Amino acid sequence: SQQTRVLQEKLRKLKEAMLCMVCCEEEINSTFCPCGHTVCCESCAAQLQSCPVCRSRVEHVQHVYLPTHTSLLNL
Amino acid sequence: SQQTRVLQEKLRKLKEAMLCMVCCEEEINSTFCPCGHTVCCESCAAQLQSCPVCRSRVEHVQHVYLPTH
Ligand SMILES: Cn1cc(Cl)c(C(=O)NC2CCCC2)n1
Ligand SMILES: Cn1cc(Cl)c(C(=O)NC2CCCC2)n1
Ligand SMILES: [Zn+2]
Ligand SMILES: [Zn+2]
Ligand SMILES: [Zn+2]
Ligand SMILES: [Zn+2]
Numbered sequence: 001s002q003q004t005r006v007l008q009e010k011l012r013k014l015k016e017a018m019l020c021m022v023c024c025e026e027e028i029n030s031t032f033c034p035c036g037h038t039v040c041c042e043s044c045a046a047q048l049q050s051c052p053v054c055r056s057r058v059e060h061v062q063h064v065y066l067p068t069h070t071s072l073l074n075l
Numbered sequence: 076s077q078q079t080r081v082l083q084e085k086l087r088k089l090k091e092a093m094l095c096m097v098c099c100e101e102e103i104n105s106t107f108c109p110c111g112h113t114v115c116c117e118s119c120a121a122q123l124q125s126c127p128v129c130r131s132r133v134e135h136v137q138h139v140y141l142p143t144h
Pocket of ligand 3: 020021022023024025026040041042043044045
């Protein structure tokens, strides 16, 4: 029904929000510290000097283990 | 249809996975450092001395700003 189409769109948008903002292909699993923005995969976070969202200096990257993780790279 | 019921269940389960594993009522927004388990809201994370997933000591809690918030 039309409701099935609406629910498919909501599911897809929530899953898109869990992907890396730089490569768009891998799940987010890294945090820029100390600002706390958690918007990249490990590969893309590794080479940023400043946060891509707030411009704060990245002192280090903290790996995050999230219950929503489903990609083979995070399991 | 039955597929509408199936998609409603999948969306519900994905939203449940974003909720604090301790209180079940608030969105996850905190990481236990250094282990990296990100499974609690800020109120439950402030009260735990050990990670509820791996039992590693919590040295400090890092707030996470996620695009899904
Ligand atoms: C961060 N972001 C936002 C959207 Cl929208 C997407 C996306 O559709 N990515 C796809 C490309 C390869 C498969 C996943 N990623
Ligand atoms: C962590 N988790 C797993 C499930 Cl399942 C739930 C849940 O249904 N929580 C509800 C209680 C108050 C409204 C949301 N939470
Ligand atoms: Zn990436
Ligand atoms: Zn930032
Ligand atoms: Zn909680
Ligand atoms: Zn842990």
